RNA sequence: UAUGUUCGUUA
RNA sequence: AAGUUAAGGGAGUGAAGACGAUCAGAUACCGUCGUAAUCUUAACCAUAAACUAUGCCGACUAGGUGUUGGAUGAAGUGCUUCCUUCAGUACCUUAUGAGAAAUCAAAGUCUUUGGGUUCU
RNA sequence: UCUGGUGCCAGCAGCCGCGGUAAUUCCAGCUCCAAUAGCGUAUAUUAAAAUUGUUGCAGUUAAAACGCUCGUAGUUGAAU
């Protein structure tokens, strides 16, 4: 069945704006798409949602290509915080 | 001098692997019994502090940009740019920003710095559609088309590679007026390295 | 720069200036101290002159020579 | 009309629209060994780049100037 | 006219930070932008004009499964009659968009024409300073310096492209497929660039290197 | 078989300019090759050549300034008399302002223009630009 | 005009090379030229190994291998798809 | 690795 | 190679030929047989896509992977490998070299046209 | 890309082509173009033709390297 790309990148736009508001239930990122998007088309308002919690559910278990918003700052401070005797032989040569 | 010296012998530069090459000859001092072959280090010097003498000439840093296709390059070369003035891209290069105006990102440089130039030599292939000079890090068989400085390090190595970007940074800060010489550095290699 | 090139000993017979690889050397058997002169890449058997024993065997090139002997170049 | 700069290694003159010669700055140093405002220039030809031999006719041309002196 | 900055060849131009042509071809820069002659050769307030005129029109057509497919190839030569001069190439669909194309690619395909003068410093160069010779395709054209009554002594193409280059006395030669006007044209184009790199023993005196544009400006480039 | 040693010289002269290499050797060397090259030097066409001379009809080794187009050997060296100077130059020389056709005459080796100041055409060697 | 630099064979500092015989239909072919596989097959499945080793003595008796060492002749090599036609390109890669 | 022919002329 | 002449040889293959098939026909492709030929010696013939479709000699211009035959120097175990070099022989990459292009390290060093020479 | 006639006929056309009902190409009228007291046509010859090449061609695949080697005449021939 697929889905297209124009449902894909109406899918990738949102999330990035609040991130704050999106949560976990299924019945509430629902909602908060309609509640936050424009779309005219009832099956495209639930058939985007669909595919924004298909990409909620791949959080907290590795990358998911995008979202550059707060919560990716904290992992990356806490991220952050004799020899072979031609090479002997090239340390004695030079000094 | 003495402890600068003393910084960089730990790493794994002076390794450089088979394949011989040609114009590496005056880079090269002799093949490994085992076929591995081995840098000078008595150029390598030398040649990354001409290289960075030549970077500080640019006026305004952020036209020189950086380029690293690997990922164990990728942090060493976007610490270099963030710690100096200059930029960089890493990873995936679009074959397009240098001669293509149109497109979004574009941003062509005066200066080019290469991590590798087999691996991303498409930049290298870039550079001379728009007069862009390119330095790069040249390992023993690296290729040496549409290159002038060419850094005779080792290429594949994590450590190597964050090495030799971040003395290149220390060298283009002690030739500004940033820091002075005299005292050592506080700066560690891992701040550098590949996680 | 070809003119003050220094490694050309290693080089190719007829480099810059054309030179014969070969040389003359004296033997000296221990034990027989005797004085002739020899051709580095003789072409034929050679024997001594004090006591007759068999000095170098000729080959394609510099020969066999002996097991023993002092042999020193002739060169000044 | 104009006179064309001229590739400082093959001393070849470099026409308009070759886009693959490079014009090379580097700085000097003071005693403490820091950058200072002024330069000096270099000018490499494409031909040169292209065939890959700009590296060690920069590093003649740089030791022809004592900017760097292990020769080759 | 009014266009939104966002190179910087194109911006430097624009503000007027270049004073001429010269330069940009000393340091070999690319032209990217119609700008660069919208904001250099203007109607008014200008030395000289630039005569654009479409040397040849070809259709050529593809031959996909349902029928033909002809768009045609527009070549023009551009040129100011004093040294500079240029030729350009475009398929289009349609002849219009490809005149105007071609336009566009021969104007940001301008170079410089060394005009070589034959008897007198004081009397303007008419002729080539040399035998130059230009290749495409099969078809080789040569240009021979030639004396100050001449005319251009070479085909109708040869006469209309060295006219825009602002040579008016040449005798030519050519071999070859020259009825290909396309690889005529190239031919004749790439003799007339070749003009400015042949190293005659007037430029062996060494001069120094000025400042590129870019390093000269690059302050003016950074308050944005 | 060589034939020609000067030509072989001027082949040589052309292909390391032409790569640039600033340096060249040329094996057979010649008096007829030494007065072509120190004539060429005379003209400014080339620096400090210098004839390594051993036993074996030496060498010569001539440093480049990056300052020839083209230098060539006309052959066979047809005998040229005062008259069709121009005939050859207009053929040969790309411009009448600078290249030299290099004549053998009853005077030794000159250029067309000084061979005409002192008359006496003679046989045709070479030219170089 | 010259699909192939070694035009078809592989005859270098040669000026004649004995022709041999195709496996297949019998025709002349060059010897350098021939397309040549040496077989080493089982004498029989993996099925019948199971049943012979079991049905055999010694109780440890291996089943001697064939050694066939075929050589076809261009068509018939290619036609038993022993070579495929092969893109320009990828008509110079060896190994 | 059985057989399986032909398509008037011009535009 | 075929072919011709004369002796010999004559297994296998097999121009011719004869059948059996296949087919609309099949004098062909397929099958069974089979003469000349194929082999040897002694004579002819002088032609092949006799082809790298690329005449011969000489010079110059670039890297790498091989490999064949010598020679030099060096080292695991009198043994064995590496380096340099000459002479072959290929291959890969590269051309701000060439070419109409395919492509070519020669088919380059050609309107910047001339090393010598023969044939077409 | 004017008007009539003819309609694969008659005819034009050096070459490419035009002519079967809208013929910018035939037969006419008007107009225009070119050279001009001159302007066409046929044949020959020169340039064009670097398609005879000394200057100055080409020979892997467009025509074209003798099957190969020896070899006389000829042509050419290291440095001093």
Redesign the pocket.
């Given at each position: 069945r697929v889905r297209t790309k124009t449902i894909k990148r109406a899918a990738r736009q949102i999330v990035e704006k609040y991130y704050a508001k999106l949560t976990l239930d299924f019945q509430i990122n629902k909602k908060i798409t309609e509640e936050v998007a424009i779309i005219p088309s009832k099956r495209m308002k639930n058939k985007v949602a669909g595919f924004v919690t298909h990409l909620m559910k791949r959080i907290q278990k590795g990358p998911v290509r995008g979202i550059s918003l707060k919560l990716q700052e904290e992992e990356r401070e806490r991220r952050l915080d004799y020899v072979e005797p031609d090479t002997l032989r090239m340390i004695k040569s030079l000094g | 001098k003495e402890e600068s010296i003393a910084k960089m012998l730990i790493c794994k530069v002076h390794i450089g692997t088979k394949?011989?090459?040609?114009?590496m000859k005056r880079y090269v001092y002799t093949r490994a019994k085992d076929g591995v072959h081995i840098i000078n280090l008595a150029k390598t010097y030398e040649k990354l502090q001409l290289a960075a003498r030549i970077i500080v000439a640019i006026s305004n840093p952020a036209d020189v940009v950086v380029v690293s296709a690997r990922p164990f390059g990728s942090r060493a070369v976007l610490k270099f740019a963030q710690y100096t003035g200059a930029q960089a891209i890493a990873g995936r290069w679009t074959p397009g920003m240098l001669t293509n105006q149109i497109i979004q990102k574009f941003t062509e440089p005066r200066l080019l710095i290469v991590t590798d130039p087999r691996t991303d030599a498409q930049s290298v292939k870039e550079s001379?559609y728009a007069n862009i000079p390119v330095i790069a890090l040249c390992d023993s068989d690296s290729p040496l088309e549409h290159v002038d400085i060419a850094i005779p390090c080792n290429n594949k190595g994590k450590e190597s590679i964050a090495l030799m970007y971040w003395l290149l940074a220390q060298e283009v800060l002690y030739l500004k007026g940033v820091i002075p010489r005299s005292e050592p550095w506080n700066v560690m290699v891992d701040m550098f390295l590949w996680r | 720069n070809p003119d003050p090139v220094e490694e050309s000993k290693?080089?190719?017979?007829k480099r810059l200036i054309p030179t014969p690889?070969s040389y003359f050397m004296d033997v000296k058997c221990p034990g027989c101290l005797q004085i002739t002169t020899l051709f580095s890449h003789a072409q034929n058997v050679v024997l001594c002159g004090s006591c007759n024993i068999m000095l170098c065997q000729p080959?394609?090139?510099?020969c066999k020579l002996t097991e023993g002997c002092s042999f020193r170049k002739k060169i000044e | 009309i104009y006179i064309p700069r001229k590739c400082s290694a093959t001393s070849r003159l470099i026409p308009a629209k070759?886009?693959?010669?490079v014009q090379i700055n580097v700085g000097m140093v003071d005693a403490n060994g820091v950058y200072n405002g002024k330069t000096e220039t270099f000018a490499i030809?494409?031909?040169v780049?292209?065939?890959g031999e700009s590296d060690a006719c920069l590093n003649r041309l740089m030791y022809e100037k004592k900017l760097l002196s292990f020769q080759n | 006219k009014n266009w939104v900055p966002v190179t910087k060849l194109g911006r430097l131009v624009k503000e007027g930070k270049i004073v001429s042509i010269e330069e940009i071809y000393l340091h070999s820069l690319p032209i990217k932008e119609y700008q660069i002659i919208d904001y250099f050769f203007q109607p008014n307030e200008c030395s000289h004009p630039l005569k654009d005129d479409v040397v040849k029109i070809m259709p050529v057509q593809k031959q996909t499964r349902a029928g033909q497919r002809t768009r045609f190839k527009a070549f023009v030569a551009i040129g100011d009659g004093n040294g500079h001069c240029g030729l350009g190439v475009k398929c289009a669909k349609e002849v219009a968009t490809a005149i105007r194309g071609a336009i566009i690619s021969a104007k940001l395909s301008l170079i410089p024409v060394r005009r070589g003068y034959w008897g007198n410093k004081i009397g303007d160069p008419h002729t080539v300073p040399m035998?130059?010779?230009g290749?495409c395709?099969?078809v080789?054209?040569?240009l021979v310096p030639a004396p100050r009554g001449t005319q251009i002594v070479g085909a109708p193409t040869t006469k209309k492209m060295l006219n825009f280059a602002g040579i008016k006395d040449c005798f030519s030669?050519?071999?070859?497929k020259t009825k290909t006007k396309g690889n005529f044209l190239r031919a004749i184009f790439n003799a007339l660039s070749?003009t400015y790199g042949?190293l005659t023993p007037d430029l062996w005196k060494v001069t120094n290197f000025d400042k590129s544009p870019y390093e000269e400006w690059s302050d003016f480039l950074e308050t944005y | 078989?060589?034939?020609?040693?000067?030509?072989?010289c001027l082949?040589?002269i052309?292909?390391?300019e032409?790569?640039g290499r600033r340096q060249v050797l040329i094996?057979?060397?010649?008096?007829?090759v030494i007065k072509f090259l120190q004539y060429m030097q005379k003209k400014g066409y080339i620096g400090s050549f210098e004839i390594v001379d051993d036993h074996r009809?030496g060498k010569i080794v001539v440093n480049l300034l990056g300052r020839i187009?083209?230098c060539?050997?006309?052959?066979?060296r047809?005998d040229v008399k005062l008259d069709e100077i121009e005939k050859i130059i207009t053929?040969?020389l790309?411009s009448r302002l600078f290249g030299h056709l290099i004549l053998t005459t009853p005077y030794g080796i000159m250029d067309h223009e000084e061979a005409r100041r002192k008359h006496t055409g003679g046989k045709v060697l070479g030219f170089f630009f | 005009?010259?699909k192939r630099?070694?035009?078809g064979r592989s005859?270098?500092?040669r000026?004649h090379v004995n022709p041999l015989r195709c496996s297949?239909?019998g025709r002349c072919v060059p010897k350098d030229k021939a397309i040549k596989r040496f077989n080493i097959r089982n004498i029989v499945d993996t099925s019948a190994q199971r049943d012979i080793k079991e049905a055999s003595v010694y109780s440890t008796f291996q089943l001697p291998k064939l050694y066939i060492k075929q050589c076809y002749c261009v068509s018939?090599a290619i036609?038993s798809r022993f070579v495929r036609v092969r893109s320009?390109e990828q008509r110079?890669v060896r190994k």
């Open positions: - | 394949n011989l090459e040609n114009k001379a | 290693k080089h190719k017979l690889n080959t394609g090139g510099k | 070759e886009h693959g010669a030809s494409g031909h780049r292209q065939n | 035998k130059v010779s290749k395709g099969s080789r054209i040569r030669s050519s071999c070859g070749k042949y | 078989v060589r034939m020609s040693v000067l030509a072989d082949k040589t052309n292909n390391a032409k790569r094996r057979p060397s010649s008096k007829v009809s187009n083209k060539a050997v006309i052959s066979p047809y053929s040969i790309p | 005009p010259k630099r070694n035009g005859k270098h500092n000026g297949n239909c018939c036609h320009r110079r």
